[PDB]
Amino acid sequence: EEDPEYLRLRNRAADLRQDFNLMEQKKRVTMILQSPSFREELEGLIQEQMKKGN
Amino acid sequence: AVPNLFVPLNTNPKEVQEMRNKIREQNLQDIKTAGPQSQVLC
Amino acid sequence: DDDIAALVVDNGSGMCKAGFAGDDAPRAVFPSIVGRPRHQGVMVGMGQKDSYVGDEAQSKRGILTLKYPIEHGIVTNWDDMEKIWHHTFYNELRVAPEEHPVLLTEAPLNPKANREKMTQIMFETFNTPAMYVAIQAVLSLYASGRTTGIVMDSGDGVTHTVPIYEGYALPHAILRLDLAGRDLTDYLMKILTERGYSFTTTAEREIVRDIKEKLCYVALDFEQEMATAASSSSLEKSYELPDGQVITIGNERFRCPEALFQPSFLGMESCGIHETTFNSIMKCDVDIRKDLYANTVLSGGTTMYPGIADRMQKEITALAPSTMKIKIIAPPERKYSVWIGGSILASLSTFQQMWISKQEYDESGPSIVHRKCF
Amino acid sequence: DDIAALVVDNGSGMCKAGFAGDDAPRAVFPSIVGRPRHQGVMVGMGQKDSYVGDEAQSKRGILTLKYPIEHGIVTNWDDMEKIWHHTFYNELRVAPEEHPVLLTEAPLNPKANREKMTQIMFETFNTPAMYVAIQAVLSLYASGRTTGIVMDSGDGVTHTVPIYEGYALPHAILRLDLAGRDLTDYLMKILTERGYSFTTTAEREIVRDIKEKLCYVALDFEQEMATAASSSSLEKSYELPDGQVITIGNERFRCPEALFQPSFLGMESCGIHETTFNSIMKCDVDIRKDLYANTVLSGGTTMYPGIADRMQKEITALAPSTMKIKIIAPPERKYSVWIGGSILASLSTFQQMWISKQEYDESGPSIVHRKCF
Amino acid sequence: DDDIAALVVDNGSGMCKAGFAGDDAPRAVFPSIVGRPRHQGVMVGMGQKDSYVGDEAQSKRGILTLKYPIEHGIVTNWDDMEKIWHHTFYNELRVAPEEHPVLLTEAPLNPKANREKMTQIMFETFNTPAMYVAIQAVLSLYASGRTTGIVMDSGDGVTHTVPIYEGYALPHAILRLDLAGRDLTDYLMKILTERGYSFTTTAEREIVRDIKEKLCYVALDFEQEMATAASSSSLEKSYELPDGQVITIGNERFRCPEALFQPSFLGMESCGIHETTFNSIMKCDVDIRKDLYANTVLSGGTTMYPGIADRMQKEITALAPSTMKIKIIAPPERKYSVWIGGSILASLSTFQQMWISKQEYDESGPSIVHRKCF
Ligand SMILES: Nc1ncnc2c1ncn2[C@@H]1O[C@H](COP(=O)(O)OP(=O)(O)O)[C@@H](O)[C@H]1O
Ligand SMILES: Nc1ncnc2c1ncn2[C@@H]1O[C@H](COP(=O)(O)OP(=O)(O)O)[C@@H](O)[C@H]1O
Ligand SMILES: Nc1ncnc2c1ncn2[C@@H]1O[C@H](COP(=O)(O)OP(=O)(O)O)[C@@H](O)[C@H]1O
Predict the structure, then answer these.
(1) Least C-beta-crowded within 10 Å: which of B37, C122, D136, D331?
(2) Which residues are reported to carry the modification Methionine (R)-sulfoxide (chain D)?
(3) Residue of C nearest to E170 (CA)
(4) Interchain contact, C62 vs D287, CB within 8 Å
(5) Sign of the four-CA dihedral C202, C203, C208, C213
């Protein structure tokens, strides 16, 4: 078919799909972000690289 | 310049695919046609 | 979509990955290759182009000379680099670079001027509003969930181990080794000649790389595994070529990755990765070594060989003192972990202060990146 | 749009000609030139120095037939000029100054052939533009696919060329000097065993008609020898022009078998199936499985009944067993080249590729190597 | 009871040379072709020869189908190769094979089955007392008499470059190219096709090889030479067939060997021989490179075209840094040079302890060749 979604499914190999599913299941970015303590601790840490660089 | 000296680039294959079908249409439809008549004849 | 979201682009020697800020997964992953035709082309009226880029280049492998624009983590052909970035922005992501900021990753130790070039062709041609450059291996530690530990990243172009203490890296203890997956592919092609099979062109190198990705593993003990292969024939696998031929590689499955631990096979002076990270730990202070042993994180494509973690742990425990405890950390998605770290770094509200403004670049020239980026 | 171009196919055996954009050629006629050899006694019948084409075929009793094209090479240029004049004026009835012409010739040919062809088509007929193309590329146009290896067998020469995605590999082009004329000569040689003797050039056409009518390619050679030795069911009867009746029998499947085993003619070269397989193996690794699935037959010599099954079986035997071999033989494969010519001649993007008359004037006849292929 | 001098047998593809140890020049030189008849023998009382071997087979080329037992330096027909070895031992040298040691040569990167089969068929059939296998390029540099240099041997079948510094050979810097005399003969046939001459049979392939040997040269400037050939007809030579027919080559004289420096004419994507030598040099360590720039050695029959040395010196000087001197060493008798070195290696009193003994072969099998010789 002429749709780019159908060609998107047609082109890419199986291992890329396997990796996409694997790292879509765990959702690492969401786990780092919406967890409050670690997220705002890196917030503060980046604050002191601003303080420290110049 | 040496790999594709003989042909022009950035041409759609759909044009060739259309023309082959157009020529096959005459075979399917069994068209009567004559050749181009000359201007000096006219 | 309502607000402009930054673009996270991870660009190594092997493949290029690109996605949006805060997303779980990158949208596009494709090999970093630019191909050009070599054979005479006589078919007028159909599709021919002077250069093929991306996955389309690897599709038509049989009529191209594949050419990697990034060599050993250093960009050596900038026109092909611009073509790769254009294909990344427009063909795959289909978003204009002028609306959104971009975030790039780069090797720890490198020529200085490369960063300047990465500045100059990013503001001048693509007209981005802002960018930032970050070290590749720090993002692995950020994505793993740890602010303190030593991380090894061995991509397709370069291997480097950096120790990070309290989320804030140590420059003097950074160790860089020029031994990566491409040299392993070349060694595998060289040792596959001894069985009779010959591979010489670029497409054959791609096929050999596929063979390496399919059937390789790291032995727990080299001598015992070699004697085991000397005993029986249970260590034989058959791979079917795109021609239709079948080859039986057999003994070479654990000899190709063993060059990572014994680089004397290639003739290089430097020794293996395990003593490299051991020396990187020993270059640090005594007080912080306890946290560094317990927080060792593996990352990069080359570190996906089966059995790499057990062999690495055994070697580094043999090197380490007996009273110290060793913990290796092997994420199941380590191959993309750097990009995941980038997605963390583009979502922090403090990171809005990190961006290099276009006006600042216009004021300070291409040398703004050394003072702005750490 | 404006004036249509001319498509002319000059094989070694028969000449074909028509207008571009047409389905089938208007004029199809053998490429022979005949001259009389006996005494002429009837005063007032008029004189005729040469007989060209089909007119020489009907009055072939009192002529010595001569072929201007031999093994794909033009040996006698005067007879080629006569054939081209007859084609332009008596068969198509068009002035050559108004039309561009597209010509066909073999892959590997001497340079002087192309140079003299360009000089003849510009100097005498005064055509405004002209072009030369390889016949098998035009066969791939006729098939309609972008990828495949194409094997064309005419009356003069057999050649295989593989093309992948519009790019043609020059080092994998194979040329073999085994064609229909050699098979006709071998049939003339093996018809001696039963007592029939054909010597003069008039009887060569009779032998060619016998070959076209009552020959077929055996699937298994030794089994057919056993069958023809056991019974008389394989014999067929043919009627000569003078009224005698001949009966071939065993020689029906021995003449076309010689393509697959050229040692019958004394040639050292390999068969057509091995030539196609070797030309495939000369290519790169990644395109071989595409070439296995798109083998195209072209030319009149491949019109024997049962050629496709024998070719598929032989190439299946030679190739690795894990892949599929399919042979694509269109029923109208005799005129495939000409059909491809039409498809090429009236493309919109092809109109910039004609060799202009001014370019020939300012460059000499050497311009055809820089353009064309 | 003096020890008898050993036998030196050089076997590249397409020519076999043999002689006694300690002599200046080989006793026997003959092509490595074997022919079999294809036509029917109708005269009764004729001799019954199944196979014509060697130089004799080149006398009656008209009635045989010539074949080569070696393809690209790999012996593809062992039972056929036994005929060449038997004819060498019994008819040319007419020596007893059980009485003298035999020294043999091969290409660098070959399958191990080649060496093992050579050792097995030398001990088991001809019953030699001792044997040895030596790499050809080391023998050529022995013949040149210098203990440090890079040598590029180009013979019918193979081209290979090895560097040696102070008696040490770097294994990772060895490069091998499958661009040789037979491919040039095939290309000469292909380009002689368009002049108007056609050669198809292998008996005509020998004639084309003779034409290549008699009338070829390498031009210093390729474009200027083509312009000169187009402008005037002074660069024309005539040759007589065995049939007896004057043919004129003209332009194709300097185009057949030019494919050595530009392999893209054949369709191969590999680099030229000059860039192969340069890449082999740059793969070595820094402190030896100057010496390797001063001791380039040419060897093999394919390097016997006039003007190869000047063209290669010019090209390497165009690639190398300007501050060094590039010297090309080409002895006049370089075609035999490999064999000459073997004789020297067969005459040293130090070498005599390192022959592969039959007794140790009896318990080590044919795998002792990998343990004993390089
Ligand atoms: N599953 C696997 N098994 C073995 N090797 C792999 C695997 N995946 C990737 N590799 C190797 O790693 C390389 C890709 O490394 P990658 O991490 O993509 O580099 P970067 O991301 O730094 O560009 C490939 O060239 C391949 O040789
Ligand atoms: N129907 C047929 N069956 C078998 N052989 C044929 C048939 N038609 C033609 N031929 C053979 O093919 C030859 C004509 O081939 P042709 O396509 O005219 O070659 P070209 O056009 O290249 O000169 C004849 O000499 C004859 O030997
Ligand atoms: N005098 C010469 N001039 C040019 N080329 C030559 C000459 N002699 C031999 N050759 C080429 O060199 C090849 C012979 O190579 P040779 O050195 O005999 O290989 P090897 O010794 O490894 O068998 C022949 O194929 C021929 O093409």
Answers:
(1) D331
(2) 42, 45
(3) C267
(4) yes
(5) positive
Tokens coding E262? 């530009």
Question: Can you state the angle between helices C202-214 and C181-191, rounded to 10 degrees?
Answer: 100
* CATH number of residue C221's parent domain: 3.90.640.10
The verdict on the CB of residue E100 being under 6 Å from ligand 3 is: no
CA of D150 to the centre of ligand 2 (A): 17
**Sheet-wide strand order for E15-20:** E28-30, E15-20, E7-12, E102-106, E130-135, E356-357
Please tell me whether residue C272 adopts helix, strand or coil conformation.
coil
E216 CA closest ligand 3 atom index: 4
- Identify the chains in contact with C, defined as 3+ C-beta pairs within 8 A: A, B, D, E
C14 C-alpha vs ligand 1 centroid, how far in Å? 7
Hey, CA dihedral for E118, E122, E124, E130, is it positive or negative?
negative
Retrieve residue E248's tokens: 């004129």
Closest E-chain CA to C201 = E269
| Range of the structural domain that residue D235 is part of | 180-259
Nearest CA to ligand 1 atom 8: C301
At a CB cut-off of 8 Å and minimum separation 6, what does E76 contact? E69, E70
Q: How far apart, in whole angstroms, are the C-alpha atoms of residue E72 and residue B6?
A: 34
**Token pair listed for E238:** 């005539």
DSSP one-letter code for D51: E
Contacting chains of D (3 CB pairs or more, <8 Å) are B, C, E
Task: Scan for tokens 């013979």, then name that residue.
Answer: E155
User: How many beta carbons lie within 10 A of that of residue C315, not counting itself?
Assistant: 17
- Whether B38 and chain D come into contact, CB under 8 Å, resolves to yes
* Residue C91: DSSP 8-state: I
Residue E31 · residue E58 · CB < 8 Å: yes
Q: Are strands D355-356 and C238-240 parallel, antiparallel or unpaired?
A: unpaired
Q: Does E58 touch chain D (CB under 8 A)?
A: no
What are the angstrom distances between the C-alpha of E210 and each of E154, E188, E216, E239, E242? 18, 11, 10, 10, 11
**CA distance readout (Å), C57 to B11, C18, C202, C211:** 18, 18, 12, 19
Structure tokens at E315: 């090209």
Rounded distance, CA E150 to CA E141, Å? Answer: 8
Q: Which member of C200, C202, C266 has the closest CB to residue E172?
A: C266
Please tell me the distance in Å from C176's CA to the nearest CA on chain A.
24
Q: How far apart are CA C342 and CA D160, in angstroms?
A: 54
**B6 to chain D, closest Cα gap in Å:** 6
Nominal resolution (angstroms): 3.6
- The total number of residues shown for chain E amounts to 374
In angstroms, the CA E14 to CA E212 distance is 15
Residues of D in contact with E201 (CB under 8 A): 268
Structure determined by = cryo-EM
Amino acid letter for position C104: L
**Residue C205 identity:** R
